[PDB]
Amino acid sequence: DPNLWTVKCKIGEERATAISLMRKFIAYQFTDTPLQIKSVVAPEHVKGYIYVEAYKQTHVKQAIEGVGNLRLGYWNQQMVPIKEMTDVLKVVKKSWVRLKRGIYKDDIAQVDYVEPSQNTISLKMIPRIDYDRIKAPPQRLFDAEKIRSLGGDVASDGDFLIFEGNRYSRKFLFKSFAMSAVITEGVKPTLSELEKFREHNFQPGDNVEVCEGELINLQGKILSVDGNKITIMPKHEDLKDMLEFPAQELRKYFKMGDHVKVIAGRFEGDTGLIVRVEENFVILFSDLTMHELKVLPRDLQLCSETASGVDVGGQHEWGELVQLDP
Amino acid sequence: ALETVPKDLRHLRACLLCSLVKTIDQFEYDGCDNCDAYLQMKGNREMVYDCTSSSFDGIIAMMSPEDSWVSKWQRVSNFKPGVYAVSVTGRLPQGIVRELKSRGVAYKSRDTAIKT
Amino acid sequence: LRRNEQNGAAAHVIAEDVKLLQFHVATMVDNELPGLPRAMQKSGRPLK
Amino acid sequence: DAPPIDLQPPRYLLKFEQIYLSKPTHWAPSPMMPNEARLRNLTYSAPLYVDITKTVLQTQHQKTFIGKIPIMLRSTYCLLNGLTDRDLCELNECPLDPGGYFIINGSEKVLIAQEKMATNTVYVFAKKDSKYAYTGECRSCLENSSRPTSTIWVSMLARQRIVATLPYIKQEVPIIIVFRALGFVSDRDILEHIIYDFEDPEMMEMVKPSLDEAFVIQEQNVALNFIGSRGAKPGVTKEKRIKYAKEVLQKEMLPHVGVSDFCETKKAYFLGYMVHRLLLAALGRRELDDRDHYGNKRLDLAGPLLAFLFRGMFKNLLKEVRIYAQKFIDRGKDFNLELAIKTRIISDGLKYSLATGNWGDQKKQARAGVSQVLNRLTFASTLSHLRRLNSPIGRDGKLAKPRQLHNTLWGMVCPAETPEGHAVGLVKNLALMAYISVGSQPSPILEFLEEWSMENLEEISPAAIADATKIFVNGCWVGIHKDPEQLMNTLRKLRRQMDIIVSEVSMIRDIREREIRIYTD
DNA sequence: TTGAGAGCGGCCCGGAGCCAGCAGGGAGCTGGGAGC
DNA sequence: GCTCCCAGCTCCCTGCTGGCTCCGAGTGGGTTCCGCCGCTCTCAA
8 A cells, every 4th residue: 555755835835736746647647757656635724745645755756846836845755654544534624704804804794685696795894994094993983074074085975985995884884795705604793793783611619509400509619621511520518429510500609708700791800708699699899999799600700819909901000090181 | 537637626516426526617518427327417507516515625636546545445446537525515316316226326425524 | 733632633733833842942941952953033143 | 157047838048148337326327426425324336237148039138237236445447446636636535545445334344354275285284183194185166166165185094094085975985996986996007096106115015905905896886886875865776876976076076177077087196196195294205284384375355255255145146036937937927037136135135245244145154254344543554454364263262373473474464463352363464565366367377388398197198107297287287297497487487578477377396396386376 | 997006914172971882701591411 | 311510602781982062351332233925905097
């Protein structure tokens, strides 16, 4: 059986190099110098080098002495282990999208209308434009009056407007974009994007309780965490046996009077002592600001480092002096 | 040969039975190169669309199938040389499967990819 | 490496990129190594 | 000397044949005064053009701009050429300034001369610290050799045989099997090539171990297979190992005496000459050589330096042009010459190298201190910094001898002018009468020899080399003659009258050992 | 509508330990045959 | 004719020669230097 040899090529041109070499084999297979190799392999997830299935490195060299994309592998080729054949051959696997190219790269766009021609779709998008002021960009709301005042390439149709190379806006850009240039899977816009247009997070050292099943109302400490079905190892009170529970069965229950932290939300980054634990609402007085925060047990978290008392930007602390106006 | 060899990268799609990776132009001009008599690929487009899958992962240039362990792995050692697909995502229609079974050619799926 | 071991796991790119990461952390320890060439910057000066 | 670039597919080759140098001119095309250039922090760089001959269908493209090349002041193509004191003071430049320095980015820079070992000359030194008894080294390099200089070592082992150290060779190959790989498998012509006067019994007892070790190989092909073995790129079998051995024998083995099958016998004779020198060194009849001899040291000026640097980066430019044309012919489109040539990659690279003084292209390490800033403090200071000489031997070291003061300095360097700090003696300042040889082609000299009566080494009978005197030109061996008398006098008087022998080219007649060397270098 | 430009996006010797390779004693192993 | 002192063997072990890291006195002052290539859309003709 022929063996596989790694030969290096230009990145992003492996398929074109393979097509060129097999076309050269077609053009020279009936000649006096045929290619004695068996095949070539170009995986879709492997970039930088390709595989040659052949018996000899001399045959590999005689195959790759063609187009100059394979020069650095023409200097030397490497071998593939016999057990790596299978690992080479294996292949592993009113909406919202994100644009690929242009100045609007990686931005949330709302697919409003889908054209049945399967070519372009209409997107409502936030314009990253300077309204023809700097160019002769952060996201901001479209200003039809401002762009009409600045003039230039602009056409006014009330709420609808055309500017800067057939960029269409209404009330918000409403422009057709390519199906291949948009990504329709794996977007998941957040609440801020919803306003403009489940999850499990368990950490070791925290206490979680079981509220259902034959092991009901059982509080135990978190030892491990997994993706969906954790099969946790809880340290239950008066129970040295090491049970198993998923995140759906567990609930982040904390004992009365402990330092609790908010992982995310409006009250994120705060530390405080709880007041009364209801079934969903937990009220706490935060430490730096003795203020009532009503948060969820899922948003709650236990840690030993209290609030630092400084902003997210690292510029102003709590209880600080600033200038509202001069 | 060159008739089996595709001429361009546009509209590449693989067959469902022999996993032959050829373009729409030579499906229209020649059809299949392996089981054309068993499929009657010539003279239509809707049935060719049903009998071909546009989603294929990886291609292999088997041209010496009598001495190729890769050809023995994908069971294409008895087929003609050409461009074949490792994985083909699709299935023939029930009537075509039943008529192939009646003619004596059992349809074996080429979907060798691991689904999760 | 983390993404590749999460999804691909073809193990050849894994081993080769692990060797380059090992060379990178070895460069972090010392830029000058008798066994491997030193790292290079676009400014033309050797790394410290 | 740069070969035309040929590429297939429709073949085409591009060749450069005519230089069109121009007066320095920036853009609106106008010449720059050196004063205003150094005031606006510009450079005194002159445009350069070539003509292009392409054959895809022959096309000619004359006056094609490569880049801008720096010019030092008061040169033959400078604006300050032939202008008198009145014209120069009207042009607000000093008439008494010597000139001859580069101005880059407004900064005033002067090259310092580098001292180098002599080229294409056998040299014998004491090597008792190593395992060898003696070593004879030869730096082989052609005039305008695209490859850099190579070094051939021959070594007498201390114990009693002779081996060799060769480029791209990881072993110490015997001289006899080298001769057999060259083709001289006969002991008789091996002896007649290693000696000139046949009656040498002392040579018998000091050569017998080498041949008495190496006689067992008697085949040229077997010897070439041995050369290919233990090499940088050894063949799997004798096939292509013979090719590796042949390309080593051609390209690497003595290129200064020529690279051809006709030059192969000259290579063999000259290898016999170095081993003869090694034998006389071992006997001690001929005195050994000193590395501190400034006769055996050469002094590079800016000319060879700039020529070498431009050669290397012009090779890089040709690499860029050929990969650009290869990209377009892969794309199936005709290559564009003006977009193929890069004024940036020529002019900016030259400017960076000259301004920095590091002797590389962008990164290279590289030798620094090649060019410094002129000390505009005193006229005497300027003259000293202009006539300054640099020995690149290792500073901050305890090696006393190369920075010691040598006897060979009467009238070449003033004795009592040294730097005082960490480097005392490695930096010299040029004396008054001392002048550097500009160098000349030795082809009219060889034509003088051959119109005269000094026969080449290939036509002369071997045994009747015992009586005659050897004749070398620029180190490499040319021929022999029976009586050097009256032809030494003819060469002297022709040098005096500058009819065909120039005053600059020198000749030395060793009468103690029967030879004469001509130096055009 | 197409072509190039602006800007975003990605790619010269010193010592001295020091291991490794090799070379000579050395007792165990089992034959050799002396002894019973 | 089988132990056992002995001979040859056979591993056994301490005892000699090579590639190799690491060092190489004190301040001022001036000069040079820190991407390149790729790539897609904007305005101009």
